[PDB]
Enzyme design. Structure first.
Site, PDB file in Angstrom:
ATOM      1  CG  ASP A 281     -24.515  29.848 -31.287  1.00 42.70           C
ATOM      2  OD1 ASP A 281     -23.982  29.443 -30.239  1.00 42.70           O
ATOM      3  OD2 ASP A 281     -25.631  29.451 -31.696  1.00 42.70           O
TER       4      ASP A 281
ATOM      5  CB  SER B  39     -15.661  21.087 -15.891  1.00 43.50           C
ATOM      6  OG  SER B  39     -15.211  21.740 -14.715  1.00 43.50           O
TER       7      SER B  39
END
Length: 330
Positions: free
Chosen positions: A35, A199
């Site tokens: 994770d 992004s």
């Protein structure tokens, strides 16, 4: 040193991925959920409330000659999906894919929430976010990666998740045969303890690319892709019959649909998520309403590049003094 381990979907939907981990001496192999959005290595154990164990493999520290109680240490964690766990702490030898760390904090669960009990395939989590998020008190502990880092050939790990198929986590090297083209690297902020990056925009299907900054986290422990409501609405508007359902808990779509791809930007590069990756199947057995793999982050407080996005790429988690993230097509 290096390590290399195969990671395998837990079910037909890729709801999560499990990777075998050797703990203790002699080895006890547990299948852990790696994770990158948390920083605790915790396991079902011989100390876990019996009614809360249902099929998991447990760690039994009393059977390990290298286990030592970390006296006074406790831990307690709550995840974004509302699940939780807590317990005490041992140090022991932990190996992943041939890479061994001695003195790793292994957090033994005394209690786990129902979501964990009900998932027989996940024996615990191995956190790979920054150690500043580790919950051990009163002495915070380091992640497996942080402990291994100085010994690694290169201070990196890579995630190569499969779509409906096994993939690979590598530690200490970049497998140049595992991706196509070049790797594009992008800046990381560690201010919130995550692999947080920005992004450069998105496209829906064959549509034009929208240049826009989207801050979010690379999170292997989250199933879906969670993005701003504007982006998500633009995606689902291209699927006839798709709608957001408050009763179901997100966007659903007709199971008869063909889903468009979704592209996200990494610098000047582009990662394409095929439409099939966005299909999470019937909302309930036999339903013709299917659950979407792109969902709104509104009210999470952060955008999350979960498995839906990450499995479309070869992803480098560069833990150099100034951390960065790399993405390549594959």
């Amino acid at each position: 040193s290096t390590g290399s381990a195969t990671t395998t979907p837990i079910d037909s939907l890729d709801d999560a991925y499990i990777t075998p981990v050797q703990i203790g001496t002699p080895a006890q192999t547990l299948n852990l959920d790696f994770d990158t959005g948390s920083s605790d290595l915790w396991v079902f154990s011989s100390e876990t409330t019996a009614s809360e164990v249902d099929g998991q493999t447990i760690y039994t520290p009393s059977k390990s000659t290298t286990a030592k109680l970390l006296s006074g240490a406790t831990w307690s964690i709550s995840y974004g999906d509302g699940s939780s766990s807590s317990g005490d702490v041992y140090t022991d030898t932990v190996s992943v894919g041939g890479l061994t760390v001695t003195g790793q904090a292994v957090e033994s669960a005394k209690k786990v929430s129902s979501s964990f009990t009900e998932d027989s395939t996940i024996d615990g989590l191995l956190g790979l976010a920054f150690s500043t998020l580790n919950t051990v008190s009163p002495t915070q502990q380091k992640t497996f990666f942080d402990n291994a880092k100085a010994s690694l050939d290169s201070p990196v790990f890579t995630a190569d998740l499969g779509y409906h198929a096994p993939g690979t986590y590598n530690f200490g090297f970049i497998d140049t045969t595992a991706y196509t083209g070049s790797i594009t690297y992008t800046a990381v902020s560690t201010k919130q303890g995550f692999w947080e990056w920005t992004s450069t925009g998105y496209a829906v299907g064959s549509g034009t690319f929208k240049s826009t900054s989207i801050d979010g986290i690379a999170d292997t422990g989250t199933t879906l892709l969670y993005l701003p409501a504007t982006v998500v609405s633009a995606y689902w508007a291209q699927v006839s019959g798709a709608k957001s359902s408050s009763s179901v808990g997100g966007y659903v779509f007709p199971c008869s649909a063909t889903l468009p791809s979704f592209t996200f930007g990494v610098g000047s590069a582009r990662i394409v998520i095929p439409g099939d990756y966005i299909d999470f199947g019937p909302i309930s057995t036999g339903s013709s309403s299917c659950f979407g793999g792109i969902q709104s982050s509104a009210g999470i407080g952060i955008n999350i590049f979960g498995d839906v996005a990450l499995k479309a790429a070869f992803v480098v988690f560069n833990g150099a003094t100034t951390p960065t993230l790399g993405f390549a097509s594959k």
